[model samples]
Target: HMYTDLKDKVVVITGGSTGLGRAMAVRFGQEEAKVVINYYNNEEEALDAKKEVEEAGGQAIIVQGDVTKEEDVVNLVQTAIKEFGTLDVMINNAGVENPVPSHELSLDNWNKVIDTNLTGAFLGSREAIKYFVENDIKGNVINMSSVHEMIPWPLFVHYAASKGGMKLMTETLALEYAPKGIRVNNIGPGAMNTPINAEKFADPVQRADVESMIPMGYIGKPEEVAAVAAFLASSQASYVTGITLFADGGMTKYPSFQAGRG
Candidate 1:
């Protein structure tokens, strides 16, 4: 009962059509929160999320837009306020990643990753904070980071850089807005069973390789991350701000040295 009462709260989740975003939508719905689910290039998945939200006893709206565009990000926040009257929680979960060797990574790919993962989050946070300040509303923001933010994957230079930037961005914003009653935090998840990792998980060897990095010895579920999002949004974490909650099942705790084989 971390979030004992979320009734009537308006929550906007970017990339809420699938993966961890969808999972968070469902969880918020169960709390009876009005949800604005933002999606890009995926009408079908957005519709599915809408239905699921409705089924969970909450109101839902599907907003299709690219997170990288400033206009689109503004529209998303405006739509949420227009439809739900006000926004309470904003989750910056939309992101993109591609595997490219550090030396061979193209500038276009790097830009794309940075735009979606880092810049998009900035836009969302900015809009939400502005709205909260103007309306005198206490707001909550959750950014989706990854273990790569700290682990530094060699082949995912752009992805790692974006998340690394997110870490600092979240902290800075949190410090800036704490006096205004705005809470901003990051959720850094480890390997999870999600649509984004479908192909890799489909290959047993690749899946095992990922699992080996987690001392917990199992892949995480998206709901686990969603649970964290729900808590962070609630008053239960009223004093919690400017920190990255690592829901990585001990992955960040040095699995390689678990047996003291240094």
Candidate 2:
């Protein structure tokens, strides 16, 4: 009842094979939206997501493409329009992150993270916006940002930079396209239980350390973030734009003093 009925809406989600992307795809499918799941690799996971979408009683299409490549990005948009006849929501959820000390961070690693996390989102957003403008379609664009955008991580320099760039990117695009009835927003999730953080969380000590940063005292589920995505994509958020909805269990609320510690 929260979403404004996504029935028949066509959605394109990048990096939808697993993790947060997969969860969002399932949510959209449940809303009866036609979904196109894009993945760079992991055919098995991609297929699984497609099956879940189908089981949710919505049309699903799987496309293989690299988010870092412009041609692939263009093709992704084309697939949504070609298969679903139109594109209603574009979710740029593909990204890469790794820990690297600022002094020792290799240029190659930095470029890889920036290209995939920041440039890829820009490419996807640009293509979707162009399509919406040319076709006079009112569309929604959701970028998968991170709490790193606000709280800088000590060793993850590249990851932090990419997410910080996304914040400005989302705001600039929203300001540029609000007059055209286009909505651009971001979702910044923290310490989620996803494949990306599986190893770290699998360690009880590390898991507790991470959870301590969240005032809620627990890690969040991917489904929680998916619900936020569904709301942003739906007409219920018609007046919402240029906002970063943090589904981080208060991780961004500066939890260092959770137990009265400075």
Candidate 3:
């Protein structure tokens, strides 16, 4: 109820079946916004997400599409329009990452991460921007980026590159369409308690290592990041654009310097 303006707004969330995407979708649902939940696979989970949305007092429809494919990305927008009759927000939340050392990273591995993280986000953003422009909707785009976009990770070079590209892409798009009242931004999350980090966080040593890097000294919940998405989508942030709101608990501020040892 923090943002009554979000009520009944039509939204499209890529990879909405789980993780931060799912959490954001549910948050929108709590606001009574109509949601189009897109999932690459896992129909059962998507269905559950839809149920949660409806149970939370919002309308929801699930769409199966891959963000990396042009046609599929287009279909997501089409589905939202077909089902909800309009597209008010687009959340390009579909992303994938794998830890491969820079020197040993193969072309396929690099391409896989790049295609899903960078190109996928581009396709989703492009389609949404096109719809907003054509309809004069003044819609906004929220990209699900990561802390790696700024912090260099030795084992995830491709992932970092993709997110780095996303940082500029979001800003450029925001600047390009500011005249049209369209908004574009990025959400950079640090170590989060999501499926992607399930394995790492489960290990005490790995978990402690990550916590040490965060000034807050703890991992973040998906719902915490979801709150950022909700804020960016709400009227409260109507004037905000072309920025990456890092929900990283001060991780990007160089936690190593926290104790004055740097």
Candidate 4:
């Protein structure tokens, strides 16, 4: 319901079939932006997500692609250029995570998380910037990093490391593109109500444990973070770039208060 300037902009969101990616896609569509929803599988869900975008009075297309491959990344951008005429925004929102202690983490699991979370974003950014430069679009990139990008997690070592690397990658790209009139920023969201957390959050004890770690004392909604994405993509954030906007409800504010630790 804000940033009226985002209307008609062409956007590509990786992993747009569900969760944060889907949420942001729908929000952008609500702003009347044309969106390309990229999904690896689950064509039904991806199409459903596209339908929501249409209901928002915006244009949308769905493409099947794996984010871990360079060819697929190029296809995503190329499809945008072919359909929407130009690319206005790129969202590196595809990611995966598995909870495993570092010492016990398998190489396969580590590779899966790092490949999807880190390398996937890199490919998306690289392809998008390539198009933006060739067309002189002066567009932007929004990476879906996590609060774990700064806060380390014990069991999800690979996930944490991937996000940590993403922080520097986002900052690096933002700085490198600043002179070119392009903007790159990151959104680090905390615990949220999404299909990804459905099972874990359904348990009363687990839910309370997570809420206790957040200063806001509650889980956030995907729409809340989606709003941030809209603002960042708009000219309202014209002067903003190279920062991780943490939408964690004060999760980073030190939650010791909940445990009476002062």
Q: What TM-score against the true fold does each predicted structure earn? A: 0.98, 0.98, 0.98, 0.97
Clashing pairs in 2: none
Q: What would the per-residue lDDT of candidate 1 be over residues 1-262, giving only the tens digit for each residue? A: 2466678899999999999999999999988899999999989989989999999878999998999999999999999999989989999999888787799989999999999999999999999999999999999999999987898788899999999999999999999999999999999999999998999999999999989989999899999999999899999899999999999999888888988989
Which residue pairs show collisions in model 3?
Answer: none
What is the C-alpha local distance difference test score of each model?
A: 0.93, 0.94, 0.93, 0.92
- Please, what are the lDDT tens digits per residue for candidate 3 over residues 1-262? 7789999999999999999999998999999999999999899999999999999889999999987789999988998999899999999998887787799999999999999999999999999999999999989899989888899989899999999999999999999999999999999999889887889888999999989999998899989998999999998998999999999989999988998995
**lDDT score of residue 3 within candidate 2:** 59
Deviating ranges (above 4 Å) for candidate 3: none
Alpha carbon deviation, residue 85, candidate 2 (Å): 0.3
| Residue 242 shift from truth in candidate 3, angstroms | 0.4
lDDT string for model 2 (143-249, tens) is 99999999989888999999999999999999999999999999999989999899999999999998888999889999999999999998889999999999998
**Which ranges in model 4 have alpha carbons more than 4 Å from their true place?**
258-262
Q: Which ten residues in a row have the lowest lDDT in candidate 4?
A: 253-262
RMSD (Å) of each candidate, 1 decimal = 0.9, 1.0, 0.9, 1.1
